[PDB]
Design a protein around this ligand. Structure first.
Ligand SMILES: [Ca+2]
Ligand SMILES: [Ca+2]
Ligand SMILES: [Mg+2]
Ligand SMILES: [Mg+2]
Lengths: 156, 155
């Protein structure tokens, strides 16, 4: 998708006790993901060991959140992540009884274009790199032609 | 028809353009996008206010002529335009004889996302969320989005 919404179970009301829920997010190849939380109302615990919302990018934990926090008066964002990959996983955990009636979280994500020409160490073209939304293409100086590898330019 | 990018080359490029010719190109990207048009090669007759040979960009966004180049190795841009519309017209004109054998131009265009949230008839009652190609509205907790997809309410 190019965008989506992720809401904790029962949101905007108190989340269920003793539950674990997972969501997988995927955008097209050629894009990264901007994930932003607009509501965070989770029981606070040391190192968020009990209730929590985790953001995973592989086997790698990108973030782990708990507690209550609000926003910047002109933006509802309370926490956000920008990742260079097109897949991400979010996991929500509620441990024991939710007696204080915490309401969970709300997050949104949007696909972001990867700039293949500038985001990395080397330019993927011998000569001119042209970034566009979803991909990129190489081009050449006048009187040059692009080889079949769609990367290198040559002359006859 | 609508494309996300493209190339525009003067007639006979990369060799000398013909004498006495006029050519036009219609650029179109999808709704929800603007256009970034950039020139990587400019070798046209020089005249004041480009009254003779010229490349005109119309939505007049600009008019170019003369000869100029860039030493930027991977992103040569001698002239560029960014328009918030999804259609543009480019017109190349060559008048009289091209005795100096000028070689014209090379340009590329790419669609750019329009951020509907920041550009000023607010499209959402509460929160606007921009994304590539569109935008969506959202609501504060305990408020629901009406079926019109723009206004939030409560029961
Ligand atoms: Ca790209
Ligand atoms: Ca948009
Ligand atoms: Mg708990
Ligand atoms: Mg002339």
């Amino acid at each position: 998708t190019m965008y989506g919404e992720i809401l904790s179970p029962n949101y905007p009301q108190a989340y269920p006790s003793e539950v674990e829920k997972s969501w997988d997010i995927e955008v097209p190849e050629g894009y990264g993901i901007h994930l932003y939380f607009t509501h965070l109302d989770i029981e606070l615990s040391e190192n968020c060991a009990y209730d929590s919302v985790q953001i995973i990018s592989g086997d790698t934990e990108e973030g782990r959140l708990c507690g209550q926090r609000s926003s910047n008066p002109h933006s509802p964002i309370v926490e956000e992540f920008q990742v260079p990959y097109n897949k991400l996983q979010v996991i929500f955990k509620s441990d024991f009884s939710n007696e204080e009636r915490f309401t969970g979280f709300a997050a949104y994500y949007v696909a972001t274009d990867i700039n293949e020409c500038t985001d990395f160490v080397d330019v993927p073209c011998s000569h001119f790199c042209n970034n566009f939304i979803g991909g990129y293409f190489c081009s050449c100086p006048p009187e040059y032609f692009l080889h079949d590898d769609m990367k290198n330019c040559g002359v006859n």
